[PDB]
Design a protein around this nucleic acid. Structure first.
Ligand SMILES: [Mg+2]
Ligand SMILES: [Mg+2]
Ligand SMILES: [Mg+2]
Ligand SMILES: [Mg+2]
Ligand SMILES: [Mg+2]
Ligand SMILES: [Mg+2]
Ligand SMILES: [Mg+2]
Ligand SMILES: [Mg+2]
Ligand SMILES: [Mg+2]
Ligand SMILES: [Mg+2]
Ligand SMILES: [Mg+2]
Ligand SMILES: [Mg+2]
Ligand SMILES: [Mg+2]
Ligand SMILES: [Mg+2]
Ligand SMILES: [Mg+2]
Ligand SMILES: [Mg+2]
Ligand SMILES: [Mg+2]
Ligand SMILES: [Mg+2]
Ligand SMILES: [Mg+2]
Ligand SMILES: [Mg+2]
Ligand SMILES: [Mg+2]
Ligand SMILES: [Mg+2]
Ligand SMILES: [Mg+2]
Ligand SMILES: [Mg+2]
Ligand SMILES: [Mg+2]
Ligand SMILES: [Mg+2]
Ligand SMILES: [Mg+2]
Ligand SMILES: [Mg+2]
Ligand SMILES: [Mg+2]
Ligand SMILES: [Mg+2]
Lengths: 205, 158, 204
RNA sequence: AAAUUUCGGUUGGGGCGACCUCGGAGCAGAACCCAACCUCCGAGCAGUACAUGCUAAGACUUCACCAGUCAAAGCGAACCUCAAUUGAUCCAAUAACUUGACCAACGGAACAAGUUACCCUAGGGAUAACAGCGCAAUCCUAUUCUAGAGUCCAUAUCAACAAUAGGGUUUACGACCUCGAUGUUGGAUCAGGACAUCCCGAUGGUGCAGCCGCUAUUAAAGGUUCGUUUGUUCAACGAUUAAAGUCCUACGUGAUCUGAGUUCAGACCGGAGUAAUCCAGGUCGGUUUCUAUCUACUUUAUUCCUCCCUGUACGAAAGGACAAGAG
RNA sequence: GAUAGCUGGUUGUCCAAGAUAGAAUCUUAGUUCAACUUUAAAUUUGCCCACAGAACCAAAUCCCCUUGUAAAUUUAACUGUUAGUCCAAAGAGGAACAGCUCUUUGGACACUAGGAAAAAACCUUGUAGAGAGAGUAAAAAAUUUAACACCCAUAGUAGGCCUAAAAGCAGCCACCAAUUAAGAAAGCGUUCAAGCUCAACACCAAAAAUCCCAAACAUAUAACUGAACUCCUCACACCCAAUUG
């Protein structure tokens, strides 16, 4: 079955407890599966965000449209919708309890994979719909593969190790040079100076 | 405003100053290196074999002939005992200069269909070349000896 | 020239609130009644009388023959001969031909088919503006009847809302009333669109 | 029928809906700590003795107080479990231990209702209806990969699922100065500005044989009708010209005007209400001030119709033009 | 001379200290306690403190000797504060919007000084006067992505299944191999074949309504200018709302 299985919202067990919208699930690197698995290409998420059922449907349609059913195969790398997003009625005073359930969504972090690819095909044969879906996503995406992933990682490592700038970001954050921690965040010390809410700074060290 | 936002939140003054001061500074090459300093073996073997078996090889400039014209030429060359050859020039120039054939060096250039042979073909070839409205025979090569079309037709008369 | 007030707000209020829809009162029932009225009006329009061209249009109902239903465009290769004459080529079924003739004779088009075993001829000389105006007036009367039915439905809904008004927030009552009014306006707009389409089909 | 009184509090303005005491889970993640019109689970108790007896060093203590919690021992017999699980003063019964609350408006007046558009007064934009202001949930405009139509033909044209940029013109959303006053819509004279341009000027394509058409760019120097109704811009219709365009101007302009009604006192119609009064229900009519102080101001080419072009180019026929001059 | 949680005001000079966790209240426009602050006095430990100590279902926090210091407890008084706003992070509801409503840690504003244009909340900086003195903290935005290596075509043939038909692209199979040296065909166009290319060989981002808004220069040597911050001659009690001494 070299095709993306059908995705549907509202799981078989809709949680009734209205959980609070937490932003920590978007901040930070992709703690979940980051490397490839039983494949060769993937869609590296260069920025946090969200994914709705329509997004998954459009991605599945675009993949099934241009894809060889006897030379490639893709596997889902994101679970089904679950995060309850309670949206109040457009036109009411602030207050009066919490809104009811509206739609589910699967959060995503930076450096997370969405859909994978396999088979004895080159990266150029995928590049098309790869970059297409990447531009469709609601966050900064880009076509990435094993070789290209390793290449960009080595390039980032070389840039970090050869940075002529005697002063870096972590060296100033952890050590607290000029007491700038008052503006910085507690998570910045754990991570690097490349994150900011959800975006990603691949050019910055 | 909340921590995470759909748009790019404006960073603090000190935050922006730190981000700008902690920018990446690549190296500065003082000189930059930009301003600093298989099948070919089979081709060579075939060219050497041809040179060793070129008792009466000819050279032309067959290019204006269509596919059907080339087929008709091959049929004519099969009628009277004689074969045709088509090899590159990049791999033939080194062997040309190495075989002491200096007169043939400036000849081979661009397009040229060689016609190797062994048996006498002085009249049939002349007729096959006259049947068309072209005379690309830019001096053949018999027993490794320089000779123009005049000498060729003279030997043919004999 | 905007006249575009809040409607998506009411739609979202109706979609989100589930307990209210389950208690006050039955949005599903209201929508079902509205759709049933719309379908009844559409049937009254496309089933009373109209110069419906193309044999595929007349292909509707016919008495069961030999324990098997049948229609026009099903087994016969019909071919429009002229606007004043239609051809028929049954599949060797005199009983089905007689059944179709009987079903067509009971129509309101005032036809006089000339059957000849398997061939049928249903000519139509021409139609003047009198029949068109009569059909337009009948469609207007049917639209008025549908409007009266929607009025009765909305009156029942308002009576229910009033019965359930004491121990209920007056704001929610007013919002439900506005939603019902918007639904009635949308239904009236759909009915007017259907009437205009029917008038265009009749005259055009 | 007379005599006194009241009509408790929260509500992202007030009523309505719901709540008014206490315990636990996340917010509050590792001494304590903190918010509920943020999402939940429970209780005004439940089962055996009656040493659940009399005394008393030291402590915790719901962020105060009142109220609550643990306890070496001393005398007397031995050879309680649970998490909220509740009730202060006065007063009453009681020879006297002891007891008395859905005071739940639960730190608790001994018992008190509905309306005021007939209202008065002290104040509040701490707190509303029109604005201004900020957002852009809703809409419009442009672009990005083509999904799908368009007879072959995604990109003449329409255009789903999404993202990227501009809007505060509609509905709200927040109440930030303006309730010791910003006079509320249309309709009259006057119009200033912006083009997401209806038309007069110029181009590219076209499902351009021509007009009639469609699309994209520039051009705002100008024009943008006459009337029948409902108070309502909006809302239907008759005839015009090439067109009867959108938006901001404190829903442009009431110290220029208007009262049709929108905020008032009376009445009527149906309803709510035992009654007074009310439907944000419908109409009968409802005093519109200003004597100018200041700032500022107060005199410079557009279109349509007609004539040679006429039935021309264009076809298969119908049909039917370009420019220029003149009235 | 009523009362009134309510509007208004509450008279000369100068010095000093001087911003609050919360609870109850027929209550959140008002009152009390607590907490902050002021005066006179008796006592000794007040803060960062170092090994360690402090739970099964990340920044952190408590005690903490030497060590910097001179601050802290109590007694007796009594007025004043007990509606806050913004910024960085954890957040909570809202639309992962609002100069949107509420907490936790720090700063600022209610208190002057030098700047970011006119700014409360942003950066730097506080003990108060003179001099026609000197040295410094914060302090001036940068930047223009799109061509392209454009030479050149025999055939076992229309391979087989269905397709009256797709033979090379309605659908499936293997995809050989002769041209001297390369597709049972990667696009375009055909009902269908016809025609045109290619793979390869031979040099090869912008738009809203009064009118756009600081003049302005790429080419004389990195250092200057820039406070009430520090220093220089003198003497110093002489820059906080309410309240207090
Ligand atoms: Mg209240
Ligand atoms: Mg205590
Ligand atoms: Mg004991
Ligand atoms: Mg209590
Ligand atoms: Mg009580
Ligand atoms: Mg009372
Ligand atoms: Mg009255
Ligand atoms: Mg307003
Ligand atoms: Mg199509
Ligand atoms: Mg306000
Ligand atoms: Mg006011
Ligand atoms: Mg007032
Ligand atoms: Mg005033
Ligand atoms: Mg324009
Ligand atoms: Mg106005
Ligand atoms: Mg005026
Ligand atoms: Mg009366
Ligand atoms: Mg009567
Ligand atoms: Mg007047
Ligand atoms: Mg004057
Ligand atoms: Mg004057
Ligand atoms: Mg008094
Ligand atoms: Mg009071
Ligand atoms: Mg006052
Ligand atoms: Mg006085
Ligand atoms: Mg002081
Ligand atoms: Mg009470
Ligand atoms: Mg507020
Ligand atoms: Mg201040
Ligand atoms: Mg000083």
């Amino acid at each position: 079955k070299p095709k993306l299985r059908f995705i549907e919202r509202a799981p078989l067990v809709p949680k009734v407890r209205r959980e609070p919208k937490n932003l920590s699930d978007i901040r930070g690197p992709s703690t979940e599966a980051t490397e490839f698995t039983e494949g060769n290409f993937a869609i590296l998420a260069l920025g946090g965000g969200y994914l709705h059922w329509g997004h998954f449907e459009m991605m599945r349609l675009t993949i099934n449209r241009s894809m060889d059913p006897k030379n490639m195969f893709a596997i889902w790398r994101v679970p089904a919708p679950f995060k309850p997003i309670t949206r109040k009625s457009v036109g009411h005073r602030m207050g009066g309890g919490k809104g009811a359930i509206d739609h589910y969504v699967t959060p995503v972090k930076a450096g997370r994979l969405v859909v994978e690819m396999g088979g004895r095909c080159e990266f150029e044969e995928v590049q098309g719909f790869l970059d297409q879906v990447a531009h469709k996503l609601p966050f900064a995406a880009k076509a990435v593969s094993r070789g290209t992933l390793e290449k960009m990682r080595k390039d980032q490592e070389e840039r970090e190790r050869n940075n002529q700038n005697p002063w870096t970001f972590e060296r100033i954050a952890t050590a607290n040079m000029l007491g700038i921690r008052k503006v910085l965040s507690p998570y910045d010390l754990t991570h690097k100076g490349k994150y900011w809410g959800k975006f990603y700074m691949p050019k910055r060290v | 405003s909340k921590a995470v936002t759909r748009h790019r939140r404006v960073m603090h003054f000190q935050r922006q100053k730190l981000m700008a001061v902690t920018e990446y500074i690549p190296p500065k090459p003082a000189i930059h290196p930009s301003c600093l300093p298989g099948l070919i073996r089979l081709l060579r073997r075939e060219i050497a074999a041809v040179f060793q078996d070129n008792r009466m090889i000819a050279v032309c400039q067959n290019v204006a002939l269509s596919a059907e014209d080339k087929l008709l030429m091959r049929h004519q060359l099969r009628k009277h005992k004689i074969l045709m050859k088509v090899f590159p020039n990049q791999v033939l120039k080194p062997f040309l200069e190495d075989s002491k054939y200096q007169n043939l060096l400036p000849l081979f250039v661009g397009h040229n269909m060689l016609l190797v042979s062994e048996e006498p073909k002085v009249k049939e070839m002349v007729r096959i070349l006259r049947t068309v409205p072209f005379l690309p025979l830019l001096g053949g090569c018999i027993d490794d000896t320089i000779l123009s079309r005049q000498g060729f037709i003279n030997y043919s008369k004999l | 020239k905007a006249k575009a007030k809040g409607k998506g707000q009411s739609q979202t209020r109706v979609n989100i609130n589930a307990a209210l829809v389950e208690d006050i009162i039955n949005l599903e029932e209201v929508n079902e009644e509205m759709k049933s009225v719309i379908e009844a009006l559409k049937d009254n329009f496309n089933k009373t009388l109209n110069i419906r061209t193309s044999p595929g249009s007349l292909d509707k109902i016919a008495v069961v023959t030999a324990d098997g239903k049948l229609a026009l465009n099903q087994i016969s290769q019909i071919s429009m001969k002229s606007p004043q004459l239609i051809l028929v080529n049954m599949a060797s079924f005199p009983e089905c031909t007689a059944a179709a003739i009987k079903a067509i004779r009971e129509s309101g088009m005032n036809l006089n088919p000339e059957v000849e075993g398997t061939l049928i001829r249903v000519p139509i000389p021409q139609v003047t503006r009198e029949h068109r105006e009569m059909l337009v007036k009948l469609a207007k009367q049917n639209t008025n009847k549908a409007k009266d039915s929607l009025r009765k439905v909305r009156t029942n809904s308002m009576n229910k809302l009033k019965k359930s008004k004491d121990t209920v927030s007056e704001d929610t009552i007013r919002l439900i009333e506005k939603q019902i009014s918007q639904m009635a306006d949308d239904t009236v707009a759909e009915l007017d669109r259907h009437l205009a389409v029917k008038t265009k089909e009749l005259l055009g």
